[PDB]
Amino acid sequence: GEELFTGVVPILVELDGDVNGHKFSVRGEGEGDATNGKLTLKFICTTGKLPVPWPTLVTTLVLCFARYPDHMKQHDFFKSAMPEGYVQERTISFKDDGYYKTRAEVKFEGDTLVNRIELKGIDFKEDGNILGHKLEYNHNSHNAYITADKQKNGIKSNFKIRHNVEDGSVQLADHYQQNTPIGDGPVLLPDNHYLSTQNALSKDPNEKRDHMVLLEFVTAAGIT
Numbered sequence: 001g002e003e004l005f006t007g008v009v010p011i012l013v014e015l016d017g018d019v020n021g022h023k024f025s026v027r028g029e030g031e032g033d034a035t036n037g038k039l040t041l042k043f044i045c046t047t048g049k050l051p052v053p054w055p056t057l058v059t060t061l062v063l064c065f066a067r068y069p070d071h072m073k074q075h076d077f078f079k080s081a082m083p084e085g086y087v088q089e090r091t092i093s094f095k096d097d098g099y100y101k102t103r104a105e106v107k108f109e110g111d112t113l114v115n116r117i118e119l120k121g122i123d124f125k126e127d128g129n130i131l132g133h134k135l136e137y138n139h140n141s142h143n144a145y146i147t148a149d150k151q152k153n154g155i156k157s158n159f160k161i162r163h164n165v166e167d168g169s170v171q172l173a174d175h176y177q178q179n180t181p182i183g184d185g186p187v188l189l190p191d192n193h194y195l196s197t198q199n200a201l202s203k204d205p206n207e208k209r210d211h212m213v214l215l216e217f218v219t220a221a222g223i224t
Contacts, residue, residue, distance in 0.1 A: 081183070088178075
C-alpha cells in the first residue's frame with residue numbers, strides 16, 4: 001500500500017464540471033512525491049475559458065501524497081486503500097452564494113495515480129464572487145482535521161477555506177468531505193488528527209490556454 005509511494009508517481013487529473021449550466025473540463029498532469037509531501041501539476045481548461053476562479057477548485061483537483069510522519073504511518077487511510085483506491089465526495093458551500101457537489105475516484109491506473117472528478121455547481125449568483133471572478137489568484141495555508149467514520153469504513157473531515165476577495169473581504173467556503181474505499185481490502189482507520197497544507201499558484205510564461213501551475217505540500221500531524 002504505502003509502498004507504491006516510495007518514489008515519484010505520475011499523476012493525471014480529469015474533471016468535468018457544470019456550474020449553473022456553465023460546463024467546462026480541466027486536465028492536469030504532473031507528479032507526486034509522498035516522502036516529501038510534494039505535488040507539482042499543471043492544469044489546463046481544455047474547453048477554453050474557466051467559468052469559475054481557479055482557486056475555488058484547488059481542493060477538488062490526491063491526499064494519498066501527504067507526508068505521514070513515521071510515528072503516524074498507522075493513520076494513513078489514503079495510501080492503505082491503494083491501488084484499489086478511494087472515493088472522495090464533498091459539498092463545498094460558499095457563504096452567501098451557491099455550492100459545489102463533487103464526486104471523485106482516486107485510484108491507480110497502470111503506474112499513474114489518477115484523479116477523475118465530476119463537479120456540479122448549483123445556485124450561484126451570476127455576478128457573485130465565483131461566477132463574477134472576484135477572487136485573488138492565491139490560496140492560504142490551512143489545517144483540516146480528519147476523523148474516522150467507522151460506520152462507512154472511511155474518514156470524514158469538515159474544514160473552512162477562506163478565499164481572498166479582490167476587494168479585501170474574505171469569501172468563505174465550507175467543505176464537508178467523506179472518503180470510502182473502492183476495493184474490499186484492509187483499510188486503516190486513523191485517530192483524530194489533521195493535515196497541514198500549503199499552496200503556491202503560478203502561471204506558465206509560454207502557456208496560452210487558461211491554466212494553473214500548482215505546487216502543493218501536504219503533511220500530517222496531531223498524533224504524539
